């Protein structure tokens, strides 16, 4: 009863705190949902889905997967048609699947292939950029290609809070007596039956 | 109920504002839901189309589930391998008797 009451009260407090924390972080989820509907949509529906905000709700359309071997990244973000202007993210040419038209496009966040090449920013000296490319990053200087690099080449900082719960191990209780009943019987000086 | 009916613009999460100034350039394909009371109101091409309940919109959850159940009550009955009567009776002769 003692152990059960303590454990039940602690775990009920944990349950209440968990429910309140979920309800409390709903606000942060609303604001992030406004900031970038695609990512929060993908996290909340469990699958990569493009999203947009229709008033106070989310319109969602399933994204279509493309194998990595069908994507080629170009060299320089500088669009030659716009001197003094540059592409903010690297250009790509991708083919949906072999026996397809090589569709031109731009690399969008989290390995998105965006058909529209509208992301244009003024060019700036000191340009140094990393972008998600497949399983790793790609790195550019001065709006010019430098190299792809693995994920392990960048210092990893954690936003995760650590919690280390281990199970209570199995325990075996052996029989244990201070005196066996035979010792109790033999404790007598004279046995009448004997 | 008896005051002057004030015209304004709807806000976020059932806010009712006083100034009608949230003006965006018009666009084709306008389709919008808005929090209205206990449900949503749906507009198409900047015209009031109809209200609907929240149950009409599919629900995705941002909450992480955690299912804690209480350890139930348990009753321990008395239980002995041998009673005192059995221990005393295991003797072949009882001197007293």
């Amino acid at each position: 009863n003692h152990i059960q009451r303590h454990v039940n009260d602690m775990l009920g407090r944990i349950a209440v705190a968990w429910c309140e924390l979920q309800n409390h972080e709903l606000t942060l989820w609303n604001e992030a949902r406004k900031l970038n509907p695609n990512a929060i949509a993908s996290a909340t529906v469990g699958r990569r889905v493009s999203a947009r905000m229709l008033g106070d709700v989310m319109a969602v359309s399933t994204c279509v997967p493309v194998a990595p071997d069908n994507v080629i990244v170009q060299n320089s973000m500088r669009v030659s048609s716009r001197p003094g202007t540059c592409y903010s993210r690297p250009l790509v040419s991708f083919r949906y699947e072999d026996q397809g038209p090589l569709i031109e496009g731009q690399l969008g966040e989290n390995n998105e292939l965006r058909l529209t090449r509208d992301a244009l920013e003024p060019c700036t000296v000191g340009h140094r950029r990393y972008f998600i490319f497949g399983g790793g990053y790609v790195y550019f200087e001065e709006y010019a290609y430098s190299h792809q690099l693995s994920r392990a080449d960048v210092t990893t900082v954690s936003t995760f809070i650590d919690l280390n719960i281990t199970m209570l191990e199995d325990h075996e209780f052996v029989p244990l007596e201070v005196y066996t009943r035979h010792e109790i019987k033999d404790s007598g000086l004279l046995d009448y039956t004997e | 109920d008896q005051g002057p009916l004030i015209e304004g613009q709807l806000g976020e999460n059932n806010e009712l504002r006083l100034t009608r100034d949230a003006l965006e350039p018009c666009t084709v394909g306008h389709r919008r839901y808005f929090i209205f009371g206990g449900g949503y109101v749906y507009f198409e091409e900047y015209a009031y189309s109809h209200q609907l309940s929240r149950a009409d919109v599919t629900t995705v959850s941002t909450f992480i589930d955690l299912n804690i159940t209480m350890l139930e009550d348990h009753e321990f009955v008395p239980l002995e391998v041998y009673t005192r009567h059995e221990i005393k009776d295991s003797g072949l002769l009882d001197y007293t008797e």
Binding site: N38, R52, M58, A59, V60, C63, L113, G134 | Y33, V57
Partner: peptide
Amino acid sequence: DANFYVCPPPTGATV
């Protein structure tokens, strides 16, 4: 994310 994705702009078919 080894696999790329093409994400057509959403319509209000699914909300």
